[PDB]
A paper describes a structure:
The membrane domain of the mycobacterial ATP synthase is embedded in the IPM, with the catalytic F1-domain of the enzyme extending into the bacterial cytoplasm and attached to the membrane domain by a central stalk and a peripheral stalk (PS). As do other ATP synthases in eubacteria, chloroplasts, and mitochondria, the enzyme couples a proton-motive force (pmf) across the IPM generated by respiration to the synthesis in the F1-domain of the enzyme of ATP from adenosine diphosphate (ADP) and phosphate by a mechanical rotary mechanism. The mycobacterial rotor consists of a membrane-bound ring of nine c-subunits, attached to an elongated central stalk, made of single copies of the γ- and ε-subunits. The mycobacterial PS is made of two proteins, bδ and b′.
Extensive classification of the data for the mycobacterial ATP synthase revealed the presence of not only the three main states referred to as S1, S2, and S3 but also of substates within them. Substates S1a to S1e are in S1, and S3a to S3c are in S3. Further round from S1b by ca. 2° lie S1c to S1e, which have similar c-ring positions to each other, but there are large differences in the F1 domain and in the PS. The positions of the top of the PS suggest that the order of procession is S1a > S1b > S1e > S1d > S1c. The main differences between the substates within each state are that the positions of the PS and F1 domains vary such that the F1-domain (including the α-helical coiled-coil of the γ-subunit) appears to pivot around the PS during the catalytic cycle. Pivot points are located around residues 59 to 66 in the b-subunit, residues 34 to 41 in the bδ-subunit, and residues 43 and 233 in the γ-subunit. However, alignment of the substates via the “crown” in the F1-domain shows that they have identical nucleotide occupancies and that the position of the γ-subunit is also maintained. Alignment of the substates via the a-subunit demonstrates that the c9-rings and the membrane α-helices of the a-, b-, and bδ-subunits of the substates are in identical positions, as are the ε-subunits, and in some instances the lower part of the γ-subunit. Each nucleotide binding site in the three α-subunits and in subunit βTP is occupied by an ATP molecule with an accompanying Mg2+ ion, while the site in subunit βDP has ADP and an accompanying Mg2+ ion. The sixth nucleotide binding site in subunit βE contains an ADP molecule with neither accompanying Mg2+ nor phosphate.
Residue numbers in the entry:
A (entry chain a): 10 to 247
B (entry chain H): 3 to 120
C (entry chain P), K (entry chain O), L (entry chain M): 2 to 86
D (entry chain d): 1 to 50
E (entry chain b): 22 to 60
F (entry chain Q): 4 to 85
G (entry chain R): 2 to 85
H (entry chain S), M (entry chain N): 3 to 86
């Protein structure tokens, strides 16, 4: 079978269900990010040659900066940069960790994954997308006031197209979330499907698919971060 | 027929009626007919211009620093310099091509194209 | 002898699938074309980036709206099927 | 079991490909950035000396 | 099944992310910005 | 049941209507936006100059789209021949 | 057994849906292309508007006309269904 | 299960398909030819008179097929081959 | 029900698909070829005649395949295979 | 409901789909190739001949797929597998 | 009599097939168009290549979404079919 | 009161027709576009002919590649229908 | 009528749709990318190598979708969900 779904380690609290597997995956990604941050702080050396982690972090910051000023300056949105770089590294680590060999057999004839990327769960992508949604909506709010924010978003660039603009205010979150989900969810299916062949034929197609999935995860992380910055700039204007 | 005017910086070279003007602009080979649209283009570094009249042998001219300007009433080729096939000596065209300097090599290549060697 | 709800459901899912096929095609091609325009504009004028967003965001916007409108009605077809009985 | 072995072989192939082709260039870029910053600091020291 | 509907995990994930964001807010981004400004 | 079959056909027809409308509207808007983007890139000062024809085209395209919307609404809700 | 008119109506609605799908696709695409041409012409030359509408409208006609035809004829499918 | 019901259903489906396809083809072709005409006129107003001669040719090739569709489409629904 | 009714209904649907595909192909191809012809004429009016030789070569070709569909669609609705 | 009857109905609908796809592809590809040829000749009328040779390598290949469709459609309709 | 779940699942499979068809068509067209823009821009001026990767990766992002989102919905059609009874 | 294999084969024939039609459409469009590129290049730079064939063969290759897979899938569908009872 | 028969027929048709769309998208996208690459090589003879790096990415982005869809055929034909 394929058993698409089947969240493991599920539990309940305060009358609400929680998926243990996705929570564990996001915890692993978060602890890896925090470990990298601590490693950077330990080996932070402006005067000396920067460490590899310092090179990585400064590369990410320089990128996200460049796009920011290309769209809007720091002083207008100082806090966007940390948000975007976070989102980026978090999603990238979440997607890349999946490359590790954590696929086994459940004795049922169907493969199982010990570490499933959180983006492959609707909860993670919805959390990220709604967090960004609230963040830049509030950013625009106090950029041009509570009263003016709905007016500007409704009128958009051209007032007489007001209805269409409204749909966009609903589209951006969903489009931000679902795409990411899909981008990762396919992999979860694909690898499972790749388990249909024997090992001596399963090794190759899985190799190719995961090799491409690395680039896919990188591209999706970059796209989500850039679109977050871009929407932040859109909401914070004039 | 269209009025071809091959004109250089130092003087005018040739003028008269023509039925076809083939050349190699930077974008690509272009053939101008009597009612071509107005146009301004830059001839390639080693451009060659072939002019065909009504029943007369084509004039093949090796052009350096060429600019083509076509109008509904006249067509002009403003060249930094330009030499006709008859005056072009094959030995120089062969020997100066593929030289150290790009400009001289292009000029030699244009002369060879005018002769036919390319 | 078949459940009327079964036939209605099959029709509703096929209709929603068609709606989303059309919406996906339209959105993908429209966004690709708008992105081609934006990329060409950037290639010609690297500094035009900002001023080119107001056009681009409009186009994508329109395109996206149409697509997402379809999305809504597809849900309407599937989750709350009109005429279901 | 068998699928696990196949996936392990696939991961080994992926790692081999990475180390063989993508690791050298990323390492080269890292070393280039290190050399650029080293040269910048050396030039700052030379400017102080001058 | 019913993949789209989110569970309580929606909330928990935010916590994790927020925690990570906190570090990037203070202990990653500002030091790197200082390093780049100094350079 | 005749009603079941006719209603299923109605939903499928509405789906076709919306699929075609979505394809047409999306691609037409993309093409008009490509034109507007190119015009802005080449002539940044034609912004207001270029809005007019672009919204003419967009309005016509969305008019076709909304006609399809209305007829889908007719099919799904006020299905003839029920 | 089933009422034949049920199958007739279902087929007619499917046919009308196909007609609308094709007409909408054609009209949207053709109108978008004509508008692209008009926008590019205006951008590259400001004051040809007074002339540019003369061909453009024609073109839109040649496009929208077809749409209307579909529209009109689609009524025949949904209301005056042949062999009903 | 009346047979003529199936006959009419198939005929109507086929007619809807042909009408949609003809609409798509006519719309796209008219739009593309109109884009060519509009750009040509924009470059040079004098050519407006000339360009109609080739442009009107293209529409003739395109619309013909569309108007052929309708024709053959009329065959299926109004007089369905194989209908008894 | 009569199987032959199913055969001819499938034949009608197949013929509709054939004719629709032929129509789309012919319309798109003729539109593109005419766009090329119109642009060329606007460019080089004196090449007008010289342009019809390739244009028709395309037209007749684009129509050719289209007409083949007709040459077969009628068969589907008049000589239905397996009837 | 004769089994072979449904077999033939499905085969006819198939054949129709194959023809629709093939006609669409052939028509559009031929139109695009003809557009390239016409534009090339209009820009450079004297190159007419030298343009035909590559133009065929494109067109001569486009219908290579289209005719293939016909072939398999025969296998669909005239000799239907599993009939 | 025929099982209602069987016909419902057949309709769901057809809907998912349409979802994939539309999504893949849109993705292919959009990726091709955006890549054409990127290639033309790089060829015209290689020095600008580094910049073009930013808008280009936006375009694909605005296109792949319209496709991958559909993939998600396709799952909802095939794995958890609404009204499966 | 019907042979299941009949329905299976009808569905397989419909599916294979979709396969082959989509493959033909993609192959034709891609071949035409690549050939347009080749013809424009030859017209503008006749000397470039020897250079242009190498990339063109690649462009067609992939464009034809997909086609043959669909062609190959004929063997899988109209002769080796999976799920055949 | 065995339900699995209807399920398998639906799965076959769905897979046919999946690959039809996948091939249409992949073929057209690869053709467009190759058009860009060929024109670029014609314009700048030596650019060919420096044009592969973007072009392949486009191909990688295109074939991806096709490859993805190529998997679901199995999922539809060899592992039809809800086959029961």
């Amino acid at each position: 079978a394929i058993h698409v779904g089947h969240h493991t380690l599920v539990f309940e609290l305060f009358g609400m269900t929680f998926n243990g597997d996705t929570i564990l995956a996001t915890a692993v990604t978060a602890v890896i990010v925090i470990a990298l941050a601590f490693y950077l702080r330990a080996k932070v050396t402006s005067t000396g040659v920067p460490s590899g982690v310092q090179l990585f972090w400064e590369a990410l910051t320089i990128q996200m900066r460049q796009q920011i000023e290309g769209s809007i300056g720091m002083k207008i949105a100082p806090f966007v940069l940390p948000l975007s770089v976070t989102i980026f590294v978090f999603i990238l680590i979440s997607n890349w960790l999946a490359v590790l060999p954590l696929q086994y057999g459940g004795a049922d004839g169907a493969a199982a994954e010990l570490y499933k990327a959180p983006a492959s769960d609707i909860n993670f992508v919805l959390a990220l997308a709604l967090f960004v949604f609230v963040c830049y909506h509030a950013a625009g709010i106090w950029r041009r006031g509570i009263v003016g924010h709905p007016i500007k978003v409704v009128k958009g660039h051209v007032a007489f197209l007001a209805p269409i603009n409204i749909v966009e205010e609903l589209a951006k979150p969903i489009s931000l979330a679902l795409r990411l989900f899909g981008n990762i969810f396919a992999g979860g299916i694909l690898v499972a499907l790749i388990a249909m062949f024997p090992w001596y034929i399963q090794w190759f197609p899985n190799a190719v698919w995961k090799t491409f999935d690395l680039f896919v995860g990188l591209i999706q992380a970059f796209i989500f971060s850039l679109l977050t910055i871009l929407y932040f700039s859109q909401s914070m204007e004039l | 027929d269209l009025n071809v005017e091959i004109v250089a910086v130092e003087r005018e070279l040739w003028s008269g009626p023509a039925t076809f003007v083939f050349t190699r602009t930077t974008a690509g080979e272009i053939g101008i007919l009597p009612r071509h649209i107005p146009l301004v283009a830059q001839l390639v570094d080693d451009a060659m211009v072939r002019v065909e009249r009504e029943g007369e042998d084509d004039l093949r001219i090796a052009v350096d620093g060429g600019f083509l300007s076509v109008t509904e009433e006249t067509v002009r080729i403003l060249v930094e310099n330009a030499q006709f096939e008859s005056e072009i000596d094959a030995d120089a065209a062969k020997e100066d091509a593929a030289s150290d300097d790009e400009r001289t090599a292009a000029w030699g290549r244009a002369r060879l194209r005018a002769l036919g060697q390319i | 002898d078949l459940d009327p709800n079964a036939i209605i459901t099959a029709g509703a899912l096929i209709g929603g699938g068609l709606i989303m096929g059309g919406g996906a095609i339209g959105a993908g091609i429209g966004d690709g074309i708008a992105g081609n325009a934006l990329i060409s504009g950037i290639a010609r004028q690297p500094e035009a980036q900002g001023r080119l967003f107001t056009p681009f965001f409009i186009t994508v916007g329109l395109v996206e709206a149409a697509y997402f409108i379809n999305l809504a009605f597809m849900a309407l077809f599937v989750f709350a099927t009109p005429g279901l009985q | 079991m068998s699928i696990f072995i196949g996936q392990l072989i696939g991961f080994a192939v992926i790692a081999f490909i990475i180390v063989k082709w993508v690791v050298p260039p990323v390492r080269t870029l890292m070393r280039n950035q290190q050399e650029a910053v080293r040269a910048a600091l050396a030039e700052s020291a030379e400017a102080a000396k001058k | 099944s019913n993949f789209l509907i989110p569970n309580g995990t929606f909330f928990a994930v935010l916590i994790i992310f927020l925690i990570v964001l906190g570090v990037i807010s203070k202990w990653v981004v500002p030091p790197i910005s200082k390093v780049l400004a100094e350079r």
